[PDB]
């Protein structure tokens, strides 16, 4: 018994917290992007360039946690 | 059909694997255990896409006019300019090698993600029913294998540029002094900068893996769990949404690859 | 338990998806490619008139 | 009540003791009652509403300015 | 056996956290969008277009967690 | 028996978190809508239109989570 | 009996988290309503009408979670 | 038996979550009330009137949860 | 017997959550109070009067839950 | 015996949440205080005064919790 | 016996919550301190004096919880 | 035997928490960066370098929770 | 048996929380540092000096909680 | 899911396509575009000289 289900619960923790961290952090960054864009429309291609530049750092560790949660669900269990 | 849906979902995930010892097309009922079992589907579809990209672009690179371009040429030069601009703005060193690497990543990853869009059972149906082949799954990017192979390639390049442009003394001084730059805390900096370095490729590989694997798994589930008539209404939204996923995950991989190398050389 | 009927459901969704892409996604791309041809053509025509 | 001056570079347009004004400030319409905290804003063109003391309303048209 | 309900409780946690993350992240992004829309009404179609691009990022991880929940609830149990 | 019982606990976490996520996301978005409406009264119906559009994106995942909470509590019950 | 007592805990989570969701969601919304009133005392009714409209959306899922909390706690017990 | 202290924990859950919900909801709304007062320190009675109007709503669900916490705390628990 | 353990635990949770709720709710209200004061000290005693008028409400459910928490811990033991 | 474990756990969680509450409640208030001082440098002693006035309210329930935490850990256990 | 490992888990959570509470509280205070320093940099020694004064008031409950956590880990366990 | 598996339930906590810490920690930081970039759009390449300097300090303690989390899962078991 | 495992789970909870505390505290402090610097580039070296000074305080209590996680795994084990 | 030899297989295919694209595609296309850009801009040189 105790082999399977705890790994499913561990994965459910990893992937749930990774979705919380990613979706709030990306929402905040995108909000500040839209505020700048509404102020400075000519900048929108410049600002969206900087948005993607910064955004790539935000989910890097949440994607670590999702990749390992997939490994524990599919690879081990 | 004798397939239980509960196991139909599983068989999909199982790869076609070639055992370096037996050279045998394994099937989902029993998985053998060794490292040397290449995932046949991934290599073949990956090189098919990457060589198709190289041939189409080489054929225009051979013809290419400085007059009014053909419409097809216009789309190719459009994306050439799209990449060139992104490189020029992000990277301010000389090296010739950055731009083609970025172009290969962007188009090849875009094509690999695009591979997922085609209906999940259609090629497995062709393989099993007509061609009698034992297994198939078509998307390279769904694997960890391809995504870590690429990310480790970029990690090597980081080491190459950082020793080329500023060398061992600068590189080690950054790793040892920065962040604090305080000689009293060098061991802490050594940990923090090592794990910061290693975080960049592992995150690169796992982001793309996790997105494309779960997208495939959704298509598998929709095909497996629901009644087929009901499946169209749910499947159309996910396919549309997935278009945006496949595009942004390719774009983001290219963008970060450039940023990490520009940060490494400067 | 019809792999076919589920393949029928896939075929419905996939044709719906293509029809959407052709009405809504490809024409925006072709319009930009045609705008690029336009900018190239006008650039060359104005360069010839300055040479004259 | 509070003392309001409306003044142009050329001339004075109003002076008096006022109960309230309603004003189309640039970032959305505004209202000034007595004791209102110190504030500074540009305004858009349009009718300002004046409520003089003993409630006697009158309008003024402003082409812009700073409040 | 009692393995089933632990798998259900894991999936329940994972979907709950994914709905919190999605709802808050989009809620913030939409709030800053509406501020921009109030300032620049002629811009709102353009800002609405740019708003969907980042909204797709914000939802990407939540859709992973929803898919894995559905796998555990429907397919494993 | 407990197989039956813990499924109410799972439904409770699913529905509680979906309620928190929905009510917070809509509350933030509505606050920014009321701030715009107070500033720009003539814009009120146009902003109302955009508010409903973006509210429909905010509520999708909470409604998935309550849809599963109702499936669990009535179907596996 | 072993069954009903745990169901008091499942009601306690459903009704508690629905309380957090409705309380904070409406607290934020009403705060922005008060800002709008303080700028425009002359428009205080019109904004109150818009507040009540959006307040009716915000509490919809909390009303679901409490309605079923009452069903589980009193009626299924 | 195990029932009694479990039901007191269930009440303690509902009282904790209702205290959090009410205290944050009213603190946010009251903060916006005080800034609105500091803006127009002569309109305090009107703003206080509208503040109590919305306060009754933000309290409504918390006061349900406290009443039920009370119900179990002195009846079944 | 065991009953002491869960009664002390229920007191610790119920008062710990009431403590967070009151601490942050007053910290937020006080933040807006001190901002409004620093903008114009002449108002400070009027703002102080209205601040305490509001602060009396934020404390309601926290102090109720403390009253029940002390009753449980000492009297029910 | 088994009483020790849950007494120590109760007092730990009780006082952890008290640290969470009081440190954030004063962090926020201290932030708006330091904004005020950096906007308005003369008022500082009057700002410091009224800051201390409200600081005494934030600590009220956290100090109860910490006082009761020492009681559990050293007077009972 | 079981006894010691629960005491380790209790000290672990007590100091983990102390670390969150103090780190975020000092982050918020430090942020408003830095914006103030950027506004009036000739006041940095006075702002340092006040920042340290307030920092002494924030950390008191965290350092109390640290003290108990360290006593339980080294002395009791 | 659970001696191989509860490590993985612990590891899901370790890095899952750190992921929300890092992702929201970067997400806030990137948010303030983008606003300044819209205010100082010429200065951005300076700003981006200063962003990377301070971002480089965000990593460390999330990175330890990741590294020890992986080490617990694959070095310790 | 699992006596030794719970010490790893205690280390995990302690380090996971300390990672949240430090990562958010530095995320906010660094954000306000960036906005200050964007407004005043001549100040950037002075601001960065005060940033490193305040960051030392932010880090110290997370540092002790992480050192206790390391001592639990390595030294007590 | 698990680790595999395929990672090395893809790494070889990747570095080959990297060098092939680098030499053959990239300078030829960028040279074609910049040769067009040159002949268009030198048409302005015609006007600068003619006007002077």
TrEMBL record, chain B:
Q: Where in the cell is it found?
A: Cell membrane; Membrane
Q: Which UniProt keywords apply?
A: ATP synthesis, Cell membrane, CF(0), Hydrogen ion transport, Hydrolase, Ion transport, Membrane, Transmembrane, Transmembrane helix, Transport
A GO term from the CC aspect:
plasma membrane
- What topology does the record note for this protein and the membrane? Multi-pass membrane protein
* BP GO terms, sorted: proton motive force-driven plasma membrane ATP synthesis
Q: Write one Gene Ontology MF term.
A: hydrolase activity
Q: Transmembrane residues, as ranges?
A: 33-57, 97-115, 144-163, 208-230, 236-261
Per the record, the similarity remark reads: Belongs to the ATPase A chain family.
Described purpose of this protein according to its UniProt entry: Key component of the proton channel; it plays a direct role in the translocation of protons across the membrane.
Q: What is this protein called?
A: ATP synthase subunit a
Origin species, per record, is Escherichia coli
User: Its gene?
Assistant: atpB
């Amino acid at each position: 018994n105790l082999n399977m289900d705890l790994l499913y619960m561990a994965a459910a923790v990893m992937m749930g917290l990774a979705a919380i961290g990613a979706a709030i952090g990306i929402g905040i960054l995108g909000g500040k992007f839209l505020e700048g864009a509404a102020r400075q429309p000519d900048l929108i291609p410049l600002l969206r360039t900087q948005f993607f530049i910064v955004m790539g750092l935000v989910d890097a560790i949440p994607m670590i946690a999702v990749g390992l949660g997939l490994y524990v669900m599919f690879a081990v269990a | 059909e004798n397939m239980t849906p509960q196991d139909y979902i599983g068989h999909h995930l199982n790869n076609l694997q070639l055992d370096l010892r037996t050279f045998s097309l394994v099937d989902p009922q029993n998985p053998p255990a060794t490292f040397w079992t290449i995932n046949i589907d991934s290599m073949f579809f990956s090189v098919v896409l990457g060589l198709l990209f190289l041939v189409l672009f080489r054929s225009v690179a051979k013809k290419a006019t400085s007059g009014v371009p053909g419409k097809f040429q216009t789309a190719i030069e459009l994306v050439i300019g799209f990449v060139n601009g992104s490189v020029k703005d992000m990277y301010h060193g000389k090296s010739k090698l950055i731009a083609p690497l970025a172009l290969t990543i962007f188009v090849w990853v875009f094509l690999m993600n695009l591979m997922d869009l085609l209906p999940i059972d259609l090629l497995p149906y062709i393989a099993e029913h007509v061609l009698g082949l034992p297994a198939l799954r078509v998307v390279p990017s769904a694997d960890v294998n391809v995504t870590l192979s690429m990310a480790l390639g970029v990690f090597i390049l980081i080491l190459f540029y950082s020793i080329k442009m500023k060398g061992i003394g600068g590189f080690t001084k950054e790793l040892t002094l920065q962040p604090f730059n305080h000689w009293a805390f060098i061991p802490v900096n050594l940990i923090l900068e090592g794990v910061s370095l290693l975080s960049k490729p592992v995150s690169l590989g796992l982001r793309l893996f996790g997105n494309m694997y779960a997208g495939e798994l959704i298509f598998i589930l929709i095909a497996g769990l629901l009644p087929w008539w009901s499946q169209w209404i749910l499947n159309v939204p996910w396919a549309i949404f997935h278009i945006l996923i496949i595009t942004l995950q390719a774009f983001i991989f290219m963008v970060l690859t450039i940023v990490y190398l520009s940060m490494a050389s400067e | 338990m019809n792999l076919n009927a589920t393949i029928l459901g896939q075929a419905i969704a996939f044709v719906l998806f293509v029809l959407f892409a052709m009405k809504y996604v490809w024409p925006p791309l072709m319009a930009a490619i045609e705008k690029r041809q336009k900018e190239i053509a006008d650039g060359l025509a104005s360069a010839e008139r300055a040479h004259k | 009540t509070y003392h309001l001056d409306v003044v142009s570079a050329e001339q004075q347009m109003f002076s008096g003791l006022v109960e309230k004004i309603q004003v189309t400030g640039s970032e959305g319409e505004l209202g000034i009652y007595p004791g209102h905290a110190p504030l500074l804003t540009a305004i858009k063109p349009g009718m300002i509403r004046i409520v003089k003391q003993h409630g006697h309303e009158e309008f003024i048209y402003l082409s812009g300015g700073i409040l």
